[PDB]
Design a protein around this ligand. Structure first.
Ligand SMILES: [Cl-]
Ligand SMILES: [Cl-]
Ligand SMILES: [Cl-]
Lengths: 12, 507
Protein backbone atom coordinates (compact mmCIF):
# COMPACT_ATOMS: atom_id res chain seq x y z
CA UNK A 1 0.00 0.00 0.00
CA UNK A 2 3.00 2.27 0.69
CA UNK A 3 3.93 1.93 -3.01
CA UNK A 4 0.78 3.95 -3.79
CA UNK A 5 1.11 6.41 -0.89
CA UNK A 6 4.71 7.37 -1.72
CA UNK A 7 3.77 7.79 -5.41
CA UNK A 8 0.80 10.02 -4.52
CA UNK A 9 3.13 12.25 -2.45
CA UNK A 10 5.54 12.65 -5.39
CA UNK A 11 2.94 13.46 -8.05
CA UNK A 12 0.40 15.54 -6.09
CA UNK B 1 33.87 2.18 -9.44
CA UNK B 2 32.73 -1.19 -8.07
CA UNK B 3 30.18 -1.29 -10.93
CA UNK B 4 33.06 -2.29 -13.25
CA UNK B 5 32.42 -5.98 -12.51
CA UNK B 6 29.37 -5.81 -10.19
CA UNK B 7 26.80 -4.72 -12.80
CA UNK B 8 28.03 -6.99 -15.69
CA UNK B 9 28.21 -10.11 -13.51
CA UNK B 10 24.80 -9.34 -11.94
CA UNK B 11 23.37 -8.93 -15.45
CA UNK B 12 24.61 -12.44 -16.28
CA UNK B 13 23.04 -13.83 -13.08
CA UNK B 14 19.66 -12.34 -14.07
CA UNK B 15 20.15 -13.94 -17.51
CA UNK B 16 21.01 -17.32 -15.92
CA UNK B 17 18.82 -20.35 -16.69
CA UNK B 18 18.59 -21.28 -12.99
CA UNK B 19 15.63 -19.45 -11.40
CA UNK B 20 17.24 -19.53 -7.95
CA UNK B 21 20.30 -17.70 -9.34
CA UNK B 22 18.10 -15.12 -11.10
CA UNK B 23 16.12 -14.67 -7.87
CA UNK B 24 19.28 -13.91 -5.88
CA UNK B 25 20.36 -11.39 -8.55
CA UNK B 26 16.93 -9.72 -8.52
CA UNK B 27 16.90 -9.10 -4.77
CA UNK B 28 20.46 -7.71 -4.90
CA UNK B 29 19.80 -5.47 -7.91
CA UNK B 30 16.61 -4.30 -6.17
CA UNK B 31 18.65 -3.24 -3.12
CA UNK B 32 21.23 -1.56 -5.41
CA UNK B 33 18.34 0.52 -6.84
CA UNK B 34 17.75 2.21 -3.45
CA UNK B 35 20.93 4.35 -3.33
CA UNK B 36 21.86 7.31 -5.57
CA UNK B 37 25.35 5.87 -6.17
CA UNK B 38 24.42 2.31 -7.20
CA UNK B 39 21.07 3.24 -8.78
CA UNK B 40 22.94 5.53 -11.19
CA UNK B 41 25.12 2.56 -12.20
CA UNK B 42 22.00 0.58 -13.16
CA UNK B 43 20.66 3.49 -15.24
CA UNK B 44 23.94 3.64 -17.22
CA UNK B 45 23.66 -0.07 -18.16
CA UNK B 46 20.97 -0.82 -20.84
CA UNK B 47 21.97 -4.49 -20.73
CA UNK B 48 21.13 -4.54 -17.01
CA UNK B 49 17.82 -2.76 -17.61
CA UNK B 50 17.03 -5.16 -20.49
CA UNK B 51 17.68 -8.10 -18.15
CA UNK B 52 15.36 -6.66 -15.48
CA UNK B 53 12.58 -6.06 -18.02
CA UNK B 54 12.85 -9.58 -19.47
CA UNK B 55 13.07 -11.28 -16.05
CA UNK B 56 10.07 -9.32 -14.71
CA UNK B 57 7.72 -10.43 -17.51
CA UNK B 58 9.13 -13.96 -17.91
CA UNK B 59 9.66 -15.12 -14.31
CA UNK B 60 7.20 -17.28 -12.36
CA UNK B 61 8.94 -16.33 -9.10
CA UNK B 62 6.75 -13.73 -7.36
CA UNK B 63 9.58 -12.27 -5.27
CA UNK B 64 11.66 -11.90 -8.45
CA UNK B 65 8.71 -10.26 -10.24
CA UNK B 66 8.29 -7.93 -7.25
CA UNK B 67 12.01 -7.09 -7.04
CA UNK B 68 12.41 -6.50 -10.79
CA UNK B 69 9.23 -4.38 -10.91
CA UNK B 70 10.29 -2.38 -7.85
CA UNK B 71 13.71 -1.78 -9.43
CA UNK B 72 12.13 -0.29 -12.58
CA UNK B 73 9.85 1.74 -10.30
CA UNK B 74 12.91 3.18 -8.49
CA UNK B 75 14.58 4.01 -11.83
CA UNK B 76 11.44 5.86 -12.97
CA UNK B 77 12.01 8.66 -10.42
CA UNK B 78 14.82 10.10 -12.60
CA UNK B 79 15.21 11.35 -16.18
CA UNK B 80 17.98 8.85 -17.00
CA UNK B 81 16.00 5.90 -15.58
CA UNK B 82 12.80 6.84 -17.43
CA UNK B 83 14.75 6.93 -20.71
CA UNK B 84 16.51 3.66 -19.88
CA UNK B 85 13.16 1.97 -19.20
CA UNK B 86 11.68 3.43 -22.40
CA UNK B 87 14.55 2.31 -24.64
CA UNK B 88 14.77 -1.23 -23.19
CA UNK B 89 11.16 -2.00 -24.18
CA UNK B 90 9.94 -1.41 -20.61
CA UNK B 91 6.45 -0.12 -21.49
CA UNK B 92 5.03 -3.28 -23.22
CA UNK B 93 6.39 -5.36 -20.32
CA UNK B 94 4.96 -2.93 -17.75
CA UNK B 95 1.61 -3.04 -19.58
CA UNK B 96 1.77 -6.85 -19.50
CA UNK B 97 2.27 -6.82 -15.71
CA UNK B 98 -1.08 -5.00 -15.31
CA UNK B 99 -2.58 -8.50 -15.56
CA UNK B 100 -0.62 -9.57 -12.46
CA UNK B 101 -2.60 -11.10 -9.52
CA UNK B 102 0.13 -9.80 -7.18
CA UNK B 103 -0.89 -6.37 -5.86
CA UNK B 104 2.68 -5.12 -5.28
CA UNK B 105 3.64 -6.01 -8.86
CA UNK B 106 0.45 -4.39 -10.22
CA UNK B 107 1.08 -1.25 -8.14
CA UNK B 108 4.72 -0.98 -9.24
CA UNK B 109 3.54 -1.31 -12.85
CA UNK B 110 0.88 1.41 -12.79
CA UNK B 111 3.04 3.85 -10.78
CA UNK B 112 5.98 3.35 -13.17
CA UNK B 113 3.68 3.71 -16.20
CA UNK B 114 2.18 6.86 -14.66
CA UNK B 115 5.65 8.38 -14.19
CA UNK B 116 6.55 7.52 -17.80
CA UNK B 117 3.31 9.12 -19.06
CA UNK B 118 3.99 12.25 -16.96
CA UNK B 119 7.65 12.82 -17.84
CA UNK B 120 8.90 10.67 -20.75
CA UNK B 121 8.37 11.59 -24.42
CA UNK B 122 7.10 8.84 -26.73
CA UNK B 123 5.52 7.16 -23.67
CA UNK B 124 1.91 8.00 -24.58
CA UNK B 125 2.16 6.51 -28.09
CA UNK B 126 4.14 3.55 -26.71
CA UNK B 127 1.49 2.74 -24.08
CA UNK B 128 -1.29 3.16 -26.67
CA UNK B 129 0.49 0.82 -29.10
CA UNK B 130 1.11 -1.80 -26.38
CA UNK B 131 -2.65 -2.04 -25.67
CA UNK B 132 -2.48 -0.07 -22.41
CA UNK B 133 -5.89 1.62 -22.71
CA UNK B 134 -7.90 -1.61 -22.78
CA UNK B 135 -5.93 -2.91 -19.78
CA UNK B 136 -6.39 0.29 -17.77
CA UNK B 137 -10.15 0.45 -18.44
CA UNK B 138 -10.51 -3.20 -17.40
CA UNK B 139 -8.71 -2.36 -14.12
CA UNK B 140 -11.36 0.25 -13.21
CA UNK B 141 -13.32 -2.55 -11.50
CA UNK B 142 -10.61 -2.73 -8.80
CA UNK B 143 -11.55 -1.54 -5.30
CA UNK B 144 -8.34 0.23 -4.17
CA UNK B 145 -9.27 3.90 -4.64
CA UNK B 146 -5.64 5.13 -4.58
CA UNK B 147 -4.93 2.62 -7.35
CA UNK B 148 -7.98 3.86 -9.27
CA UNK B 149 -6.82 7.48 -8.88
CA UNK B 150 -3.49 6.65 -10.52
CA UNK B 151 -5.16 4.56 -13.25
CA UNK B 152 -7.77 7.22 -14.06
CA UNK B 153 -5.03 9.86 -14.28
CA UNK B 154 -3.13 7.64 -16.74
CA UNK B 155 -6.27 7.47 -18.90
CA UNK B 156 -6.61 11.27 -18.74
CA UNK B 157 -3.01 11.69 -19.95
CA UNK B 158 -3.62 9.18 -22.75
CA UNK B 159 -7.07 10.42 -23.79
CA UNK B 160 -6.37 14.18 -23.75
CA UNK B 161 -6.35 15.47 -27.34
CA UNK B 162 -6.31 12.00 -28.93
CA UNK B 163 -9.39 10.61 -30.70
CA UNK B 164 -7.85 7.14 -31.03
CA UNK B 165 -7.49 6.87 -27.24
CA UNK B 166 -10.92 8.37 -26.49
CA UNK B 167 -12.62 5.94 -28.89
CA UNK B 168 -10.76 2.97 -27.38
CA UNK B 169 -11.98 3.98 -23.91
CA UNK B 170 -15.52 4.35 -25.28
CA UNK B 171 -15.27 0.99 -27.09
CA UNK B 172 -13.89 -0.77 -24.00
CA UNK B 173 -16.85 0.31 -21.81
CA UNK B 174 -14.94 3.18 -20.17
CA UNK B 175 -17.91 5.55 -19.50
CA UNK B 176 -19.87 2.85 -17.62
CA UNK B 177 -16.97 2.20 -15.23
CA UNK B 178 -15.98 5.87 -14.86
CA UNK B 179 -19.56 6.88 -14.01
CA UNK B 180 -19.64 3.98 -11.51
CA UNK B 181 -16.58 5.43 -9.73
CA UNK B 182 -18.39 8.77 -9.42
CA UNK B 183 -21.53 7.18 -7.89
CA UNK B 184 -19.71 4.82 -5.48
CA UNK B 185 -16.60 6.37 -3.91
CA UNK B 186 -15.89 9.46 -1.76
CA UNK B 187 -12.07 9.68 -2.15
CA UNK B 188 -11.53 13.22 -3.45
CA UNK B 189 -8.45 12.57 -5.61
CA UNK B 190 -10.19 9.68 -7.39
CA UNK B 191 -13.41 11.64 -7.91
CA UNK B 192 -11.30 14.55 -9.17
CA UNK B 193 -9.12 12.49 -11.56
CA UNK B 194 -12.19 10.57 -12.82
CA UNK B 195 -14.09 13.83 -13.49
CA UNK B 196 -11.22 15.08 -15.69
CA UNK B 197 -11.40 11.89 -17.78
CA UNK B 198 -15.17 12.24 -18.21
CA UNK B 199 -14.57 15.89 -19.13
CA UNK B 200 -12.13 14.96 -21.91
CA UNK B 201 -14.61 12.30 -23.12
CA UNK B 202 -17.56 14.74 -22.95
CA UNK B 203 -16.00 17.15 -25.50
CA UNK B 204 -16.89 15.37 -28.77
CA UNK B 205 -20.61 15.22 -29.66
CA UNK B 206 -20.70 11.53 -30.68
CA UNK B 207 -19.10 10.53 -27.35
CA UNK B 208 -21.65 12.28 -25.09
CA UNK B 209 -24.60 9.77 -25.24
CA UNK B 210 -22.56 6.98 -23.64
CA UNK B 211 -21.85 9.11 -20.55
CA UNK B 212 -25.49 10.28 -20.42
CA UNK B 213 -27.13 6.85 -20.84
CA UNK B 214 -24.90 5.37 -18.11
CA UNK B 215 -26.31 7.94 -15.64
CA UNK B 216 -23.38 10.38 -15.79
CA UNK B 217 -25.48 13.55 -15.41
CA UNK B 218 -26.80 12.36 -12.03
CA UNK B 219 -23.43 10.96 -10.93
CA UNK B 220 -21.70 14.26 -11.76
CA UNK B 221 -24.53 16.22 -10.11
CA UNK B 222 -24.00 14.17 -6.94
CA UNK B 223 -20.71 15.98 -6.23
CA UNK B 224 -21.75 19.60 -6.96
CA UNK B 225 -22.06 20.40 -3.24
CA UNK B 226 -18.73 18.75 -2.33
CA UNK B 227 -16.08 20.89 -0.51
CA UNK B 228 -13.53 20.36 -3.29
CA UNK B 229 -13.53 23.37 -5.63
CA UNK B 230 -11.59 21.59 -8.40
CA UNK B 231 -13.97 18.60 -8.24
CA UNK B 232 -17.12 20.76 -8.47
CA UNK B 233 -15.64 22.79 -11.34
CA UNK B 234 -14.75 19.72 -13.43
CA UNK B 235 -18.22 18.25 -12.78
CA UNK B 236 -19.82 21.52 -13.95
CA UNK B 237 -17.68 21.76 -17.10
CA UNK B 238 -18.47 18.13 -17.96
CA UNK B 239 -22.19 18.62 -17.28
CA UNK B 240 -22.29 21.66 -19.57
CA UNK B 241 -20.54 19.75 -22.37
CA UNK B 242 -22.95 16.83 -21.89
CA UNK B 243 -26.10 18.94 -21.44
CA UNK B 244 -26.44 19.53 -25.22
CA UNK B 245 -27.09 15.78 -25.65
CA UNK B 246 -29.05 15.39 -22.38
CA UNK B 247 -31.94 17.70 -23.35
CA UNK B 248 -34.29 14.72 -23.79
CA UNK B 249 -32.63 12.65 -21.03
CA UNK B 250 -35.10 11.83 -18.26
CA UNK B 251 -34.62 11.93 -14.47
CA UNK B 252 -32.85 15.31 -14.30
CA UNK B 253 -34.98 16.76 -11.48
CA UNK B 254 -32.51 16.33 -8.61
CA UNK B 255 -29.69 17.89 -10.66
CA UNK B 256 -31.82 20.88 -11.71
CA UNK B 257 -32.68 21.67 -8.07
CA UNK B 258 -28.96 21.73 -7.19
CA UNK B 259 -28.11 23.86 -10.24
CA UNK B 260 -30.63 26.51 -9.12
CA UNK B 261 -29.05 26.48 -5.64
CA UNK B 262 -25.61 26.94 -7.26
CA UNK B 263 -26.81 30.21 -8.85
CA UNK B 264 -26.43 31.66 -5.33
CA UNK B 265 -22.74 30.65 -5.18
CA UNK B 266 -20.06 33.23 -4.31
CA UNK B 267 -17.91 31.80 -7.15
CA UNK B 268 -18.94 33.51 -10.40
CA UNK B 269 -17.55 30.60 -12.46
CA UNK B 270 -19.93 28.25 -10.62
CA UNK B 271 -22.85 30.59 -11.36
CA UNK B 272 -21.91 30.84 -15.06
CA UNK B 273 -21.68 27.06 -15.46
CA UNK B 274 -24.93 26.43 -13.57
CA UNK B 275 -26.73 28.97 -15.78
CA UNK B 276 -25.32 27.37 -18.95
CA UNK B 277 -26.43 23.86 -17.96
CA UNK B 278 -29.90 25.12 -16.95
CA UNK B 279 -30.12 26.88 -20.33
CA UNK B 280 -29.35 23.60 -22.12
CA UNK B 281 -31.54 21.36 -19.94
CA UNK B 282 -34.63 23.60 -20.18
CA UNK B 283 -34.60 23.68 -24.01
CA UNK B 284 -37.61 21.75 -25.37
CA UNK B 285 -38.23 19.71 -22.20
CA UNK B 286 -41.41 20.60 -20.31
CA UNK B 287 -40.58 18.49 -17.23
CA UNK B 288 -37.25 20.31 -16.85
CA UNK B 289 -38.95 23.68 -17.44
CA UNK B 290 -41.61 22.88 -14.82
CA UNK B 291 -39.15 21.57 -12.23
CA UNK B 292 -37.00 24.72 -12.45
CA UNK B 293 -40.10 26.91 -12.01
CA UNK B 294 -41.18 24.91 -8.94
CA UNK B 295 -37.88 25.40 -7.06
CA UNK B 296 -37.82 29.19 -7.59
CA UNK B 297 -35.60 29.11 -10.68
CA UNK B 298 -37.08 32.35 -12.08
CA UNK B 299 -36.12 34.46 -9.05
CA UNK B 300 -32.65 32.88 -9.11
CA UNK B 301 -32.15 33.51 -12.85
CA UNK B 302 -33.47 37.07 -12.57
CA UNK B 303 -31.12 37.70 -9.65
CA UNK B 304 -28.29 36.12 -11.68
CA UNK B 305 -28.92 38.51 -14.60
CA UNK B 306 -29.00 41.46 -12.16
CA UNK B 307 -25.83 40.31 -10.44
CA UNK B 308 -24.08 39.68 -13.79
CA UNK B 309 -24.37 43.25 -15.09
CA UNK B 310 -22.62 43.51 -18.48
CA UNK B 311 -20.98 40.05 -18.24
CA UNK B 312 -22.61 38.52 -21.32
CA UNK B 313 -21.05 35.12 -20.53
CA UNK B 314 -23.55 34.99 -17.64
CA UNK B 315 -26.55 36.98 -18.91
CA UNK B 316 -26.81 35.16 -22.26
CA UNK B 317 -27.38 31.63 -20.79
CA UNK B 318 -29.50 33.09 -17.97
CA UNK B 319 -31.73 34.96 -20.45
CA UNK B 320 -31.93 31.88 -22.69
CA UNK B 321 -33.03 29.77 -19.71
CA UNK B 322 -35.71 32.37 -18.90
CA UNK B 323 -36.80 32.38 -22.57
CA UNK B 324 -37.21 28.58 -22.38
CA UNK B 325 -39.08 28.78 -19.07
CA UNK B 326 -41.58 31.36 -20.42
CA UNK B 327 -42.92 29.25 -23.33
CA UNK B 328 -44.73 26.01 -24.15
CA UNK B 329 -45.51 24.33 -20.83
CA UNK B 330 -48.09 24.37 -18.02
CA UNK B 331 -46.31 26.95 -15.84
CA UNK B 332 -45.23 29.23 -18.71
CA UNK B 333 -47.86 31.72 -17.51
CA UNK B 334 -46.67 31.48 -13.90
CA UNK B 335 -43.14 32.01 -15.26
CA UNK B 336 -44.13 35.05 -17.36
CA UNK B 337 -45.65 36.68 -14.25
CA UNK B 338 -42.74 35.60 -12.02
CA UNK B 339 -40.22 37.59 -14.07
CA UNK B 340 -42.25 40.75 -13.39
CA UNK B 341 -42.97 39.90 -9.74
CA UNK B 342 -39.24 39.37 -9.08
CA UNK B 343 -38.33 42.72 -10.70
CA UNK B 344 -36.81 41.29 -13.90
CA UNK B 345 -38.44 43.57 -16.49
CA UNK B 346 -36.13 46.61 -15.91
CA UNK B 347 -32.93 44.61 -16.42
CA UNK B 348 -34.39 42.54 -19.29
CA UNK B 349 -35.16 45.75 -21.22
CA UNK B 350 -31.79 47.27 -20.24
CA UNK B 351 -29.95 44.41 -22.01
CA UNK B 352 -31.47 45.45 -25.38
CA UNK B 353 -29.35 48.61 -25.18
CA UNK B 354 -25.54 48.68 -25.82
CA UNK B 355 -22.98 47.52 -25.05
CA UNK B 356 -24.83 44.19 -25.44
CA UNK B 357 -23.84 42.08 -28.46
CA UNK B 358 -26.22 40.38 -30.91
CA UNK B 359 -26.43 36.85 -29.34
CA UNK B 360 -27.68 38.33 -26.06
CA UNK B 361 -30.02 40.78 -27.82
CA UNK B 362 -31.51 37.92 -29.87
CA UNK B 363 -32.16 35.93 -26.67
CA UNK B 364 -33.54 39.01 -24.88
CA UNK B 365 -35.95 39.83 -27.74
CA UNK B 366 -37.17 36.22 -27.68
CA UNK B 367 -37.73 36.45 -23.90
CA UNK B 368 -39.53 39.81 -24.13
CA UNK B 369 -41.74 38.25 -26.84
CA UNK B 370 -42.71 35.47 -24.40
CA UNK B 371 -43.18 37.96 -21.54
CA UNK B 372 -45.48 40.08 -23.75
CA UNK B 373 -47.92 37.13 -23.95
CA UNK B 374 -48.80 37.94 -20.32
CA UNK B 375 -51.15 41.01 -20.40
CA UNK B 376 -49.95 42.26 -17.00
CA UNK B 377 -46.47 42.73 -18.54
CA UNK B 378 -47.80 45.01 -21.34
CA UNK B 379 -47.70 48.28 -19.38
CA UNK B 380 -44.45 47.61 -17.39
CA UNK B 381 -42.61 46.73 -20.62
CA UNK B 382 -43.92 49.96 -22.19
CA UNK B 383 -43.02 52.01 -19.09
CA UNK B 384 -39.49 50.51 -19.13
CA UNK B 385 -39.04 51.78 -22.70
CA UNK B 386 -39.14 48.47 -24.58
CA UNK B 387 -41.07 49.66 -27.65
CA UNK B 388 -38.57 52.33 -28.93
CA UNK B 389 -35.53 50.06 -28.60
CA UNK B 390 -37.35 47.09 -30.18
CA UNK B 391 -38.13 49.37 -33.14
CA UNK B 392 -34.56 50.68 -33.23
CA UNK B 393 -33.15 47.13 -33.31
CA UNK B 394 -35.63 46.12 -36.04
CA UNK B 395 -34.49 49.08 -38.19
CA UNK B 396 -30.76 48.27 -37.87
CA UNK B 397 -31.41 44.59 -38.68
CA UNK B 398 -33.63 45.44 -41.68
CA UNK B 399 -30.88 47.58 -43.29
CA UNK B 400 -28.61 44.55 -43.82
CA UNK B 401 -31.34 42.21 -45.14
CA UNK B 402 -33.43 44.72 -47.17
CA UNK B 403 -24.54 36.88 -40.16
CA UNK B 404 -23.28 39.44 -37.64
CA UNK B 405 -21.53 37.94 -34.59
CA UNK B 406 -23.02 34.56 -35.59
CA UNK B 407 -26.59 35.95 -35.59
CA UNK B 408 -28.91 36.19 -38.60
CA UNK B 409 -30.34 39.70 -39.01
CA UNK B 410 -33.50 38.00 -40.33
CA UNK B 411 -34.04 36.41 -36.89
CA UNK B 412 -33.69 39.85 -35.26
CA UNK B 413 -36.27 41.31 -37.67
CA UNK B 414 -38.68 38.41 -37.06
CA UNK B 415 -38.16 38.49 -33.29
CA UNK B 416 -38.54 42.27 -32.91
CA UNK B 417 -41.64 42.41 -35.14
CA UNK B 418 -43.07 39.38 -33.30
CA UNK B 419 -42.59 41.06 -29.91
CA UNK B 420 -44.20 44.29 -31.19
CA UNK B 421 -47.03 42.16 -32.63
CA UNK B 422 -47.78 40.75 -29.15
CA UNK B 423 -47.33 44.14 -27.43
CA UNK B 424 -49.74 45.74 -29.95
CA UNK B 425 -52.59 43.84 -28.23
CA UNK B 426 -52.61 46.76 -25.76
CA UNK B 427 -54.21 50.01 -26.95
CA UNK B 428 -51.62 52.25 -25.27
CA UNK B 429 -48.78 50.23 -26.84
CA UNK B 430 -50.37 50.69 -30.28
CA UNK B 431 -50.23 54.47 -29.78
CA UNK B 432 -46.49 54.29 -29.00
CA UNK B 433 -45.77 51.94 -31.92
CA UNK B 434 -47.64 54.23 -34.34
CA UNK B 435 -45.94 57.30 -32.83
CA UNK B 436 -42.54 55.87 -33.87
CA UNK B 437 -43.55 55.87 -37.57
CA UNK B 438 -43.37 52.08 -37.98
CA UNK B 439 -46.15 51.68 -40.57
CA UNK B 440 -43.85 52.14 -43.65
CA UNK B 441 -41.31 49.64 -42.26
CA UNK B 442 -43.98 47.01 -41.51
CA UNK B 443 -45.35 47.33 -45.05
CA UNK B 444 -41.87 46.73 -46.50
CA UNK B 445 -41.71 43.54 -44.37
CA UNK B 446 -44.71 42.23 -46.35
CA UNK B 447 -42.29 41.86 -49.30
CA UNK B 448 -39.96 39.62 -47.22
CA UNK B 449 -39.38 36.10 -48.68
CA UNK B 450 -39.47 34.61 -45.15
CA UNK B 451 -43.02 33.51 -44.24
CA UNK B 452 -42.67 34.13 -40.48
CA UNK B 453 -41.62 37.76 -41.09
CA UNK B 454 -44.65 38.12 -43.41
CA UNK B 455 -46.90 36.69 -40.67
CA UNK B 456 -45.74 38.96 -37.83
CA UNK B 457 -45.50 42.05 -40.09
CA UNK B 458 -49.12 41.47 -41.16
CA UNK B 459 -49.89 40.53 -37.55
CA UNK B 460 -48.72 43.87 -36.15
CA UNK B 461 -50.39 45.76 -39.04
CA UNK B 462 -53.62 43.90 -38.19
CA UNK B 463 -53.43 45.04 -34.54
CA UNK B 464 -52.61 48.64 -35.55
CA UNK B 465 -55.43 48.70 -38.14
CA UNK B 466 -58.00 48.60 -35.28
CA UNK B 467 -57.72 52.41 -35.30
CA UNK B 468 -59.33 54.01 -38.36
CA UNK B 469 -56.58 56.63 -38.83
CA UNK B 470 -53.87 53.93 -38.70
CA UNK B 471 -55.75 51.86 -41.29
CA UNK B 472 -55.72 54.89 -43.63
CA UNK B 473 -51.94 55.30 -43.23
CA UNK B 474 -51.43 51.59 -44.01
CA UNK B 475 -53.57 51.86 -47.16
CA UNK B 476 -51.76 55.13 -47.98
CA UNK B 477 -48.44 53.24 -47.76
CA UNK B 478 -49.65 50.88 -50.50
CA UNK B 479 -50.13 47.71 -48.44
CA UNK B 480 -53.20 46.51 -50.38
CA UNK B 481 -51.25 44.87 -53.23
CA UNK B 482 -48.76 42.97 -50.97
CA UNK B 483 -51.66 41.98 -48.70
CA UNK B 484 -53.71 40.76 -51.69
CA UNK B 485 -50.65 38.75 -52.77
CA UNK B 486 -50.24 37.38 -49.21
CA UNK B 487 -53.97 36.55 -49.11
CA UNK B 488 -53.26 33.48 -51.29
CA UNK B 489 -50.47 32.01 -49.13
CA UNK B 490 -50.51 28.29 -48.28
CA UNK B 491 -49.32 29.47 -44.84
CA UNK B 492 -52.71 29.93 -43.16
CA UNK B 493 -51.28 32.26 -40.48
CA UNK B 494 -50.01 34.70 -43.12
CA UNK B 495 -53.28 34.49 -45.09
CA UNK B 496 -55.37 35.01 -41.94
CA UNK B 497 -53.67 38.31 -41.00
CA UNK B 498 -53.55 39.47 -44.64
CA UNK B 499 -57.35 39.08 -44.87
CA UNK B 500 -57.74 40.80 -41.48
CA UNK B 501 -55.80 43.95 -42.48
CA UNK B 502 -57.65 44.31 -45.81
CA UNK B 503 -60.93 43.91 -43.91
CA UNK B 504 -60.05 46.61 -41.34
CA UNK B 505 -58.82 48.93 -44.12
CA UNK B 506 -62.30 48.55 -45.69
CA UNK B 507 -64.28 49.53 -42.55
CL1 LIG C 1 6.63 6.89 -7.86
CL1 LIG D 1 -5.82 -0.66 -26.25
CL1 LIG E 1 -39.61 32.33 -8.61
Amino acid sequence: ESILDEHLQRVW
Amino acid sequence: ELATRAIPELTKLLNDEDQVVVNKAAVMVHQLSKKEASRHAIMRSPQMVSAIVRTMQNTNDVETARCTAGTLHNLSHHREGLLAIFKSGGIPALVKMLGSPVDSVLFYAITTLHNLLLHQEGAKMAVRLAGGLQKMVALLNKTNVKFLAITTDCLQILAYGNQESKLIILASGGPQALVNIMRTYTYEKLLWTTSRVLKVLSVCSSNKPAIVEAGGMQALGLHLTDPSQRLVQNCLWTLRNLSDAATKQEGMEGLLGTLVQLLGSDDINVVTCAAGILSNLTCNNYKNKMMVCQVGGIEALVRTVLRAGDREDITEPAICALRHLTSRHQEAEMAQNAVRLHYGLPVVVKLLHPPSHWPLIKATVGLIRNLALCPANHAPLREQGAIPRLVQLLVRAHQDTQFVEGVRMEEIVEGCTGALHILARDVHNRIVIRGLNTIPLFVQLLYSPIENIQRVAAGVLCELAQDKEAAEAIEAEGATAPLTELLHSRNEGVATYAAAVLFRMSE
